[PDB]
Amino acid sequence: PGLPSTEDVILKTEQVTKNIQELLRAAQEFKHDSFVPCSEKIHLAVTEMASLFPKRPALEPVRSSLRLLNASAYRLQSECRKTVPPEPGAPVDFQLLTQQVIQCAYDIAKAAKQLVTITTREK
Amino acid sequence: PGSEFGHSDAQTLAMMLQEQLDAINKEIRLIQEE
């Protein structure tokens, strides 16, 4: 296993951005109930993109960008679980929540972009 | 490391996220033209 094709990276990146775009829409339209399923679709898209790369990447920038990608997806998943408290309707700071959620998506997109750039420059 | 955003509001964050997404689409477009 080596570096994936630019076409494959673009395909998985577009799935990530599409799902992030839907999350941003949910935040803006106050679909706070949609945060968990959105994050799951994002987390899945992230896993598939990460799987394009070797289990142990040789390139230092791939290692770094994958770390950011994976950590931010996990962080997002952690944040979105607050939209489904065990007691339905429990107090939640939706301003703080939305802020944290968008921060996570920002870094996911950031990492995804870096991976696109890395892949293209090696072709 | 992860990005530091301090106490940025959702409005500012949404803008920067959208800018990030726009940059990705623009880069992909540039790649598919060469």
> Could you tell me the two tokens for A78?
């952690």
**CA–CA separation, A25 vs A20, rounded Å?**
9
**CA–CA separation, B26 vs A89, rounded Å?**
41
Helix residue ranges, H only, B1-34: 10-31
Number of Cβ within 10 Å of residue A84's Cβ equals 13
Collapsed DSSP state (helix, strand, coil) of residue B2: coil
Backbone φ and ψ for A43, nearest 5 degrees, come out as -60, -40
- The dihedral formed by the CA atoms of B29, B20, A105 and A56, expressed in degrees to the nearest 10: 60
Q: Does A120 touch chain B (CB under 8 A)?
A: yes
Domain of A28?
A: 1-123
How many residues in total does chain B contain? 34
- Taking contacts as CB-CB distances below 8 angstroms, the residues of chain B near A28 are 14
> Could you tell me the two tokens for B12?
């500012």
- Tell me if A69 sits within 8 A of A108, measured CB to CB: yes
Which of B4, B24, B30 has the highest number of chain A CBs within 10 A, making it the mutation to test binding with A?
Answer: B24
Q: Does A20 touch chain B (CB under 8 A)?
A: yes
> Could you tell me the two tokens for B11?
């409005």
Experimental structure resolution, Å: 1.8
**CA–CA separation, A2 vs A117, rounded Å?**
16
Residue whose tokens read 């931010």: A72
Backbone φ and ψ for B13, nearest 5 degrees, come out as -60, -45
**Structural domains counted in chain A:** 1
Collapsed DSSP state (helix, strand, coil) of residue A117: helix
Helix residue ranges, H only, chain A: 6-28, 35-50, 60-80, 94-121
Could you tell me the CATH number of the domain that includes residue A78?
A: 1.20.120.330
